Structure 1
Amino acid sequence: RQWKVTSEDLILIGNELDLACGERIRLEKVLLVGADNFTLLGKPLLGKDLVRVEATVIEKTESWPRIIMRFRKRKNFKKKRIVTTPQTVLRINSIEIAPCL
């Protein structure tokens, strides 16, 4: 997915990321970086030298139980399943830009 992000923001990724909690990461696929007066747009992705977005793996959890229920009338067809999708909460520490235009 594409997330609109800012420093101190929280993001809920719907899977485990194979990262220890509190570990710092760099989000490399930054489509857009914007300020109050100017914005820079990638085609389709901005440069690594241009933008550096860093996050931290704050939490690793399981989603609340989701019910998957299948039912068909008059066919004795009834089924129930419970699924808990792994999730990771990340906190976006900083968004830095460099003069590389």
Structure 2
Amino acid sequence: GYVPKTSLSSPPWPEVVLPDPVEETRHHAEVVKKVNEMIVTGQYGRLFAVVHFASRQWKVTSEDLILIGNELDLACGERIRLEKVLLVGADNFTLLGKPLLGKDLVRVEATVIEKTESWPRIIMRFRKRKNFKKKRIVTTPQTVLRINSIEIAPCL
């Protein structure tokens, strides 16, 4: 069953030996204990959440803005807890869920600032030699959110 070391004897990639799950689950317990100490003692600075707000993933810190292409049917000024946060990072650690994080772990708040419409947005169709020329002008509603805080909790 031996093959002598030729060019095509072995596969060209170097083999990795993945660690055994006893020392690896123990190692993960050490790491989650470290990161949970950083969340307990407040070592982190500012956070950024990836939030699956609406239909798309917005990468978000605190104190910023998101322009969303639908009317949320809330009053301007109302606070909102964004569920479906799915990544939370700080400077020295992150947390990512499968696929979402626990609601007891991360709390992302956001107020509604303004409920505008878009700029008028032209929808023109034209086929040549056919006298086919249609024109429509569309403004979608929009709301702007101001992400107030990404507060994190020691629940690991």
Same fold (TM over 0.5): yes
Q: CA deviation at 1:87?
A: 0.1
Structure holding more strand per residue: 1
Q: CA deviation at 1:49?
A: 0.6
RMSD: 0.3
Q: CA deviation at 1:9?
A: 1.0
Measure, in 2, the Cα distance between the counterparts of 1:65 and 1:4: 27
Q: CA deviation at 1:71?
A: 0.2
Gaps of at least 5 residues in structure 2 are: 1-55
Q: CA deviation at 1:67?
A: 0.1
Larger Rg: 2
Measure, in 2, the Cα distance between the counterparts of 1:23 and 1:9: 16
What is the aligned-residue identity percentage?
A: 100
Structure holding more helix per residue: 2
Q: How many pairs does the alignment contain?
A: 101
Deviation readout 1:60-85 (Å, 9 max, x if unpaired): 00000000000000000000000000
Gaps of at least 5 residues in structure 1 are: none
Q: CA deviation at 1:38?
A: 0.2
Structure 1 residue runs of 4+, over 2 Å off?
none
RCO comparison, higher one (Cα < 8 Å, 6+): 1
Measure, in 2, the Cα distance between the counterparts of 1:42 and 1:16: 29
